[PDB]
């Protein structure tokens, strides 16, 4: 199963003991500089990435604003403030301002999907797609069609206190 990779995580994030859950903490932890660590944006990757095949996981989501999750290409830039956009190699859903969004660019796409509790992510590296479904009825939330050309990692971001993300298999 998937687990969050502590050496990637922004030092303000708090990862649960079982490495399934993430929230934003009160201050930056004193953690080693690592070139793979997101030092400004509030991101963390899973420890496993994928270069072929089809892969599923699920993400339980908080009801309060401040999260985004999906996939990132391995070459996503880790240092300094970087845009949270498909061009930077992030393909994600987000809860911000009480609305759900697919993080398209230059404008995000508001999703009229109703309340979300847990989302299934379906990554298909053979056809080139990442898709998101609300698990209660498997309604389709969004699909990004991408010709992935490198290893792709599950991506999580929490930029506000009071919300969370948690991996499930």
């Amino acid at each position: 199963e998937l687990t969050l990779d502590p050496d990637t995580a922004n030092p303000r994030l708090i990862l649960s003991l079982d490495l399934k859950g993430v929230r934003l903490g009160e201050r930056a932890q004193d953690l080693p500089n690592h070139p793979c660590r997101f030092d400004t944006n509030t991101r963390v990757l899973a420890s496993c990435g994928f270069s072929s095949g089809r892969h599923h996981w699920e993400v339980e989501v908080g009801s309060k604003d401040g999260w985004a999750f999906g996939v990132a290409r391995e070459s996503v830039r880790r240092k300094g403030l970087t845009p949270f956009t498909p061009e930077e190699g992030v393909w994600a859903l987000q809860l911000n301002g009480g609305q759900y969004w697919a993080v398209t660019s230059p404008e995000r796409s508001p999703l009229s999907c109703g309340h979300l509790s847990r989302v299934r992510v379906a990554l298909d590296l053979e056809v080139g797609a990442v898709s998101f479904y609300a698990v209660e009825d498997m309604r389709h939330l969004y699909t990004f069609r991408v010709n992935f050309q490198e290893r792709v990692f599950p991506l999580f971001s929490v930029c506000s206190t009071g919300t969370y993300l948690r991996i499930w298999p």
């Binding site: 944006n41 403030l81 930029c159």
Partner: peptide
């Protein structure tokens, strides 16, 4: 949101 800027730091997402």
């Amino acid at each position: 949101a800027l730091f997402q």
